[PDB]
Design a binder for this molecule. Structure first.
Ligand code: PAP
Ligand code: PAP
Ligand code: CL
Lengths: 7, 286, 7, 264
């Protein structure tokens, strides 16, 4: 886990 | 190719004490030490813990720092220097690094960590007044050192910074203000590293990188990313925990709790207690 | 707050 | 004889019970609140929390409770100063369930109770919750064997919770005689200390303590029923079966389970 982004 | 979205998850050998009263920036310094020692940016809490021991954590398992180390050994504690466990290290101690910070800011930091929001007027007022009444956090029977082992702020400060030739005859002692580190992290951290004498020239470039690896921003990422702990993302309400890496502010006013609290605090600062003496000595009394 | 994300 | 008397055990093995009986015996007063028990014997882990420690050069018999393995560095300080080790053992089935109850996990919460049992089984103990305990076999071994090494000046006695339960007076008398608390041991006072410490008295002690806050044993009730060899079938047969597998091998867990009559 640990997200997040911003794409 | 659209941007701006969020992901949807659903003596050269010997003990070096990194000692401080709670919330004085101990973890930040240990983060910079880990970054500096390893030449790598810590990514999770365990990377920080891998390069310095925590006495209280060790004690929880009946563990102890080596009494005759063949290397520099970094150990964090918040315990007063005169607790019986520390007396085992009278001779083995080579360095004391004592970190001090404005009690206003320790107060507010501790309050947050106690899950008391500034929105909770009653709890925050209660907390702040207890802090003032007790000259620190040694009232909290549930906190570090069981309160008693921590002492009040002046008791803790006195134990670590005074009569050091008696308690730790073979050690050098350096006291460093959190605020001075904030002011010039590279210069002050390089003084910490030189003082701890972990071996060899302090490379200012290594210092700069270690500081860059341990900024509030990097440490916020570390907290979110972790991994270990500072002491399973998005459970329910009850799964929330206070933010360990906050804003690192200086000389915060207590007025928002009520001007009377701020006034009570000032009363304390300018009185004749050991608290006031140390606040003056470290430039926290105005 | 105090818990993370993102969902 | 001067020196530390360890009251050592893996968690939930009837340690507080023995400490209560000891307090009653030493003082000749029926303990009324937790503080009456804690007044008579130190707890290593509680002391460490303050950075405090039992005296390394005791000038009197000193009782100290610990759940830590005998081989952790802190216990290493007491190699010379240790005079007696009393080690209490109890059926791990029952330690498991007692521990599960005290962690406020309900028997019908399928996922949490199952997860807890699995971890107990996978780890052969409660040393994951901390590593200072060790697994049950590690703890048992640390305290009951190579005592000539760890505590060269000490005698060692191991007693089963279950034998204490079966004949409190005979067994506690043996404990008191072993601990050497000064003077001949009067059976009448063993009997009186046992009577002051029955389950009923201790439930009363628990209630009384709660109305006065007269201490705390460490909300789940600390004084339960003291059941023996409880089935884990309710958690599921895979789990009971996984547990039995532990008993049926030649690991340290199996060895000590057999040795203390817990292997069925
Ligand atoms: N990288 C950092 N730089 C400066 N301060 C930091 C850093 N990381 C943590 N701190 C601060 O250090 C404080 C916690 O200190 P301890 O680690 O001693 O506990 C927190 O202060 P605050 O609550 O007033 O913000 C914490 O935010
Ligand atoms: N007076 C007593 N007689 C027998 N067992 C007791 C007594 N007091 C406490 N115990 C048991 O001893 C167990 C707890 O032991 P500890 O070592 O934590 O003290 C509990 O067992 P249970 O949860 O299976 O019931 C507790 O009930
Ligand atoms: Cl997504």
């Amino acid at each position: 886990x640990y997200x997040x982004x911003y794409x | 190719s659209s941007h701006h979205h969020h992901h949807h998850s659903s003596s050269m050998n010997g003990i070096r004490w990194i000692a401080s009263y709670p919330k004085a920036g101990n973890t930040w310094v240990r983060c910079m030490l880990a970054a500096y020692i390893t030449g790598k940016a810590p990514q999770v809490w365990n990377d920080i813990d891998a390069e310095s021991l925590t006495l209280e954590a060790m004690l929880r398992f009946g563990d102890l720092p080596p009494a005759e180390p063949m290397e520099p050994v970094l150990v964090k504690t918040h315990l007063k220097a005169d607790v019986p466990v520390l007396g085992l290290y009278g001779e083995a101690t080579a360095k004391v690094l004592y970190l001090v910070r404005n009690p206003r800011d320790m107060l507010l930091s501790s309050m947050r960590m106690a899950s008391i929001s500034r929105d909770d007027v009653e709890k925050s007022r209660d907390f702040a007044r207890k802090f003032i009444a007790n000259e620190g956090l040694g009232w909290n029977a549930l906190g570090a050192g069981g309160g008693v082992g921590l002492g009040s702020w002046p008791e803790n400060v006195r134990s670590w910074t005074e009569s050091s030739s008696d308690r730790f005859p073979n050690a050098d002692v350096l006291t460093m203000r959190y605020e001075d580190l904030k002011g010039d992290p590279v210069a002050r951290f390089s003084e910490i590293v030189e003082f701890l004498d972990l071996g060899g020239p302090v490379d200012i470039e290594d210092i700069r990188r270690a500081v860059a690896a341990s900024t509030l921003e990097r440490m916020r990422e570390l907290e979110k990313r972790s991994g270990g702990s500072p002491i399973m993302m998005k459970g329910g309400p009850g799964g929330a925990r206070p933010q360990f890496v906050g804003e690192g502010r200086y000389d915060q006013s207590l007025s928002f709790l009520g001007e009377d609290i701020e006034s009570d605090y000032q009363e304390l600062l300018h009185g004749d207690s050991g608290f006031a003496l140390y606040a003056k000595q470290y430039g926290y009394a105005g």
